[PDB]
Amino acid sequence: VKEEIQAKEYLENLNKELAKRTNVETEAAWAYGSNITDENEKKKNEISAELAKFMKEVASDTTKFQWRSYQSEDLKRQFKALTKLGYAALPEDDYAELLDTLSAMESNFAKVKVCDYKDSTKCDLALDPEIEEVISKSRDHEELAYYWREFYDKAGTAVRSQFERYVELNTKAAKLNNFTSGAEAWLDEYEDDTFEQQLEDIFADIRPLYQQIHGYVRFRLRKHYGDAVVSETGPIPMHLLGNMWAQQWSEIADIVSPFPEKPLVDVSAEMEKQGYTPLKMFQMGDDFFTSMNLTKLPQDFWDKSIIEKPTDGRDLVCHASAWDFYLTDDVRIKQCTRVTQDQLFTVHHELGHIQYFLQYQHQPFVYRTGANPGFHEAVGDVLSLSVSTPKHLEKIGLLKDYVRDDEARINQLFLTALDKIVFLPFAFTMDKYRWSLFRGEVDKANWNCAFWKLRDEYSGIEPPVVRSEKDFDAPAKYHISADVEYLRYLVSFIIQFQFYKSACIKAGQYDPDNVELPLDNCDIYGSAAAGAAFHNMLSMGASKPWPDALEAFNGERIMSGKAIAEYFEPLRVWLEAENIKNNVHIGWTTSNKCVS
Ligand SMILES: *[C@@H]1O[C@H](CO)[C@@H](O[C@@H]2O[C@H](CO)[C@@H](O[C@@H]3O[C@H](CO[C@H]4O[C@H](CO)[C@@H](O)[C@H](O)[C@@H]4O)[C@@H](O)[C@H](O[C@H]4O[C@H](CO[C@@H]5O[C@H](CO)[C@@H](O)[C@H](O)[C@@H]5O)[C@@H](O)[C@H](O)[C@@H]4O)[C@@H]3O)[C@H](O)[C@H]2NC(C)=O)[C@H](O)[C@H]1NC(C)=O
Ligand SMILES: *[C@@H]1O[C@H](CO)[C@@H](O)[C@H](O)[C@H]1NC(C)=O
Ligand SMILES: *[C@@H]1O[C@H](CO)[C@@H](O)[C@H](O)[C@H]1NC(C)=O
Ligand SMILES: C=C(C[SeH])C(=O)N1CCC[C@H]1C(=O)O
Ligand SMILES: [Zn+2]
């Protein structure tokens, strides 16, 4: 009770100390991600080991405080965050091995190089950008399969043994914190003992819509490739979906769009024609934020960021990332930026993270993070939703001669759906798979097909060629080799529509009883009211539980699929009718593609 006065001073000092200590770990991590070398790996891992040691002392020292006895919700909440040790709870030697494993994987992934399909001499092709360019633009189904195979063999199957040890150590670490496994560890970040159920329920409401999109896309792909490549009743061969992991299908919109003779938005060629640069694209992102009365990017951002792929022979992690350094105004992005419409969305996504950093940088160290991981992921996407509208793309002069009729509107809704709906069953399987390994629910002899079973069951997709337990495929996705929780993205795609809906209403850009203000053509650019709400929420960091953060934004406390259903309602109506009209088969048979 009266001990709380001394405890407050303890927290003030320790918070500031953790910030300064993390800053050093973060610089070392940045160094590695920007320049992968044996020497920089050593540094990175050794620094983190040192910080883990300090963390162990900190968790120990908290037991000197009767902190659960305290009056202040705020002090109790801060102390609680400090007891949460993570991997740091592992014994010295164990933590060292974990770190060496994580970087062995993350590095292997970033170092992947395949040979040219047309030329077995030219073997310096990397995922970003050589391979991803083919996956997104080639319509030679056999070339597509070739690249799919080479990549998965190298980014997935090579790190099997490493991944095995990683699950062991994650599990051990989780138990040392008295969680059942890493699943329950990850899920703790959401402060809600029913969070899993809530998601199952939401997915359940959304699933039928996904089913229809799946059916229609399969139908259209059959006309393009033939029935020899695409069956009517089988899962879709994933390598035809424009994307290496088939998480989003917007890259093949030119062949599966509802009205092929009406405008389909693809501003990449205009960006190039108008001489866009990575630097331009970021400056535009900056403009969007400042136009909403949010915070200008600081000078440290422009000085220290990496916004193009470096042209020395160096290895590096090209997967887009945003870094907070826990001082004042030292925030950065690393992105291997290309001049395309999707990349413009990515830029806004990453600047969403940066804005979050800046908004809560005045918070105590333990509150300098998302309300929950999903929130951090949503921020950028809320703006990207606006940026993607014809309304906005016409404004910045990238969309020309556009006629917004009923048919064009459907093409746009479908395009967004190939991004926003398609993704959801992907996001789920990502952690569903890992959760099941963490919880020890799959025998090691079953690990790979247990992956593809989930991809089948939820997404209705399957590998181009036959896989087995001789292959190991999950780490072919970045966030799996790099040990990054994925449920964040699912939470994001649900709640980003709650944010966007309410942002649009506050901007006077959405009225449901008004045909001239439709949610799917809302641009919040320049809205002070919208930015205001963002500020109220983002400036909180993790100071209160996420319910209180959402309440701050728009007065609501519940994660809901209502808003994302509201957005796509007009597409549902059209697509249900269209599938009936064309006698489109819905659903899929079990996949013959992973042998046990
Ligand atoms: C993971 O979950 C674990 C639960 O399984 C948990 O492990 C337990 O942590 C306990 C620490 O809180 C620890 O409890 C201590 O046990 C000592 C004796 O245990 C020994 O013999 C056991 C066999 O019988 C062995 O298995 C053990 O290895 C030990 O060798 C006790 O002597 C000790 O006591 C002291 O501390 C209490 C604390 O008092 C609290 O604070 C104030 C005092 O300042 C009190 O006023 C207040 O009321 C409050 O109770 C004192 O009361 C007492 O006088 C002694 O000073 C203590 O009970 C336990 O041993 C340990 N393991 C097991 C198997 O139980 C981990 O902590 C969890 N990890 C995380 C991250 O939470
Ligand atoms: C990468 O790190 C190495 C040492 O590991 C160093 O010699 C080199 O200068 C760095 N390269 C770049 C481009 O910074
Ligand atoms: C900008 O933000 C300030 C405080 O954050 C607020 O008072 C002001 O209304 C905002 N600007 C506009 C034009 O609304
Ligand atoms: C570029 C990012 C932001 Se860290 C990313 O990883 N994204 C953007 C949305 C989900 C996802 C992905 O790669 O799968
Ligand atoms: Zn992100």
**After which residues does the chain show a gap where C to N exceeds 2.5 Å?**
none
Alpha helices in 156-242 (DSSP H): 160-176, 182-188, 195-225
Closest CA to 172 of 50, 88, 58, 101: 88
How far apart CA 24 and CA 362 sit, in angstroms, is: 19
Query: Which ligand is nearest to the Cα of residue 376, counting in written order?
Result: 5
Closest CA to 335 of 324, 350, 357: 350
CA 174, distance to chain mean position in Å, is 23
What is the chain's Cα-based Rg? 24
How far apart CA 475 and CA 478 sit, in angstroms, is: 7
Is there a contact between 314 and 409 (Cβ–Cβ < 8 Å)?
A: no
Ligand 1 in contact with 68 (CB < 6 A)?
no
Ligand 1 in contact with 177 (CB < 6 A)?
yes
Is there a contact between 111 and 38 (Cβ–Cβ < 8 Å)?
A: no
Range of the domain at 118: 1-596
Method underlying the structure: X-ray
The strand pairing partners of 324, in sequence order, are: 331
Contacts of 138 (CB under 8 A, 6+ apart): 144
Pocket test for ligand 2, best of 30, 35, 334 (most atoms within 8 A of CB): 35
Instruction: Please count the other Cβ atoms lying within 10 Å of the Cβ belonging to residue 107.
Output: 19
Ligand 4 in contact with 420 (CB < 6 A)?
no
Instruction: Please count the other Cβ atoms lying within 10 Å of the Cβ belonging to residue 184.
Output: 16
479 catalytic? Reply is yes
How far apart CA 102 and CA 67 sit, in angstroms, is: 34
Is there a contact between 376 and 369 (Cβ–Cβ < 8 Å)?
A: yes
Is there a contact between 496 and 388 (Cβ–Cβ < 8 Å)?
A: no
- In this structure, the residue with its CA closest to atom 13 of ligand 3 is 528
Instruction: Name the domain count of the chain.
Output: 1
Find where tokens 């914190």 sit.
Answer: 177
Given the CA of residue 64, which atom of ligand 1 is nearest to it? 44
Contacts of 312 (CB under 8 A, 6+ apart): none
Is there a contact between 543 and 367 (Cβ–Cβ < 8 Å)?
A: yes
Report which DSSP code applies to 328: S
Ligand 1 in contact with 178 (CB < 6 A)?
yes
Query: Does an H or E element contain 322, and which?
Result: strand 321-324
Written in H, E and C, the secondary structure of 33-95 is HHCCCHHHHHHHHHHHHHHHHHHHHHHHHHCCCCHHHCCCHHHHHHHHHHHCCHHHHCCHHHH
**What does each C-alpha distance from 144 to 134, 149, 239, 251, 451 come to in angstroms?**
7, 9, 6, 14, 21
Is there a contact between 363 and 546 (Cβ–Cβ < 8 Å)?
A: no
How far apart CA 497 and CA 513 sit, in angstroms, is: 19
Contacts of 64 (CB under 8 A, 6+ apart): none
Given the CA of residue 63, which atom of ligand 1 is nearest to it? 41
Contacts of 441 (CB under 8 A, 6+ apart): none
The HSE-up count of residue 418 (CA atoms within 13 Å, CB side) is: 23
Is there a contact between 549 and 371 (Cβ–Cβ < 8 Å)?
A: yes
Phi, psi of 229 (to 5 degrees): -95, -40
Query: Which ligand is nearest to the Cα of residue 359, counting in written order?
Result: 3
Query: Does an H or E element contain 467, and which?
Result: strand 467-468
Whats the size of the chain, residue-wise? 596
How far apart CA 182 and CA 198 sit, in angstroms, is: 19
How far apart CA 531 and CA 148 sit, in angstroms, is: 42
Find where tokens 């703790």 sit.
Answer: 188
Find where tokens 């022979």 sit.
Answer: 313
How far apart CA 278 and CA 401 sit, in angstroms, is: 26
Helix, strand or coil for residue 309? coil
Given the CA of residue 40, which atom of ligand 2 is nearest to it? 5
Helix, strand or coil for residue 229? coil
How far apart CA 263 and CA 407 sit, in angstroms, is: 9
How far apart CA 177 and CA 42 sit, in angstroms, is: 27
Report which DSSP code applies to 460: -
DSSP code string of 418-467: HHHTTHHHHHHHHHHHHHHHHTT-S-GGGTTHHHHHHHHHHH-EE-SS-E
Q: Which tokens belong to 12?
A: 């003030």
Helix axes of 373-387 and 278-291: crossing angle, nearest 10 degrees: 100
How far apart CA 144 and CA 224 sit, in angstroms, is: 15
Resolution reached, in Å?
A: 2.3
Q: What amino acid is encoded at 291 in this protein? A: S
Is there a contact between 61 and 11 (Cβ–Cβ < 8 Å)?
A: no
Instruction: Please count the other Cβ atoms lying within 10 Å of the Cβ belonging to residue 517.
Output: 16
- Cα–ligand 2 centroid distance for 340 (angstroms): 30
Q: Which tokens belong to 6?
A: 């001394």
Instruction: Please count the other Cβ atoms lying within 10 Å of the Cβ belonging to residue 47.
Output: 19
Q: What angle do CA 47, 52, 53 make, to 5 degrees?
A: 100
The HSE-up count of residue 393 (CA atoms within 13 Å, CB side) is: 25
How far apart CA 576 and CA 580 sit, in angstroms, is: 6
**What does each C-alpha distance from 192 to 197, 200, 369, 549 come to in angstroms?**
10, 14, 17, 14
Query: Does an H or E element contain 391, and which?
Result: helix 390-395
Given the CA of residue 321, which atom of ligand 4 is nearest to it? 4
- Cα–ligand 1 centroid distance for 98 (angstroms): 28
Which candidate in 350, 392, 462, 535 is catalytic? 350
Phi, psi of 322 (to 5 degrees): -130, 130
Which candidate in 97, 133, 407, 479 is catalytic? 479
Q: What angle do CA 234, 237, 242 make, to 5 degrees?
A: 140
Given the CA of residue 529, which atom of ligand 3 is nearest to it? 14
Binding residues for Zn(2+): 349, 353, 377
Phi, psi of 138 (to 5 degrees): -70, 145
How far apart CA 124 and CA 142 sit, in angstroms, is: 20
How far apart CA 522 and CA 532 sit, in angstroms, is: 17
Is there a contact between 322 and 370 (Cβ–Cβ < 8 Å)?
A: no
Is there a contact between 44 and 28 (Cβ–Cβ < 8 Å)?
A: yes
Written in H, E and C, the secondary structure of 515-544 is CCCCHHHCCCCCCHHHHHHHHHHHCCCCCC
- Cα–ligand 1 centroid distance for 73 (angstroms): 25
Q: What amino acid is encoded at 363 in this protein? A: Q
Q: Which tokens belong to 5?
A: 């006065």
What sign results for the dihedral spanned by CA atoms 480, 482, 487, 492?
A: negative
Report which DSSP code applies to 130: I
441 catalytic? Reply is no
- In terms of Cβ atoms closer than 10 Å to its own Cβ (0-12, 13-18, 19+), residue 432 is buried
DSSP code string of 395-428: HTT-S-S----HHHHHHHHHHHHHHHTTHHHHHH
Contacts of 172 (CB under 8 A, 6+ apart): 90, 94
Q: Which tokens belong to 122?
A: 């030219």
Find where tokens 């399909």 sit.
Answer: 117
- In this structure, the residue with its CA closest to atom 8 of ligand 2 is 35
> Cis before residue 91, ω within 30 degrees of 0?
no
Is there a contact between 524 and 386 (Cβ–Cβ < 8 Å)?
A: yes
- β-strands 461-462, 594-595 pairing: unpaired
CA 77, distance to chain mean position in Å, is 27
Query: Which ligand is nearest to the Cα of residue 31, counting in written order?
Result: 2
How far apart CA 492 and CA 423 sit, in angstroms, is: 11
**Cα-based torsion angle of the residue sequence 65, 92, 365, 29 in order, rounded to the nearest 10 degrees:** 180
- Cα–ligand 3 centroid distance for 530 (angstroms): 11
Is there a contact between 159 and 104 (Cβ–Cβ < 8 Å)?
A: yes
Pocket test for ligand 3, best of 291, 293, 296 (most atoms within 8 A of CB): 293
The strand pairing partners of 595, in sequence order, are: 468
Q: Which tokens belong to 61?
A: 């020292």
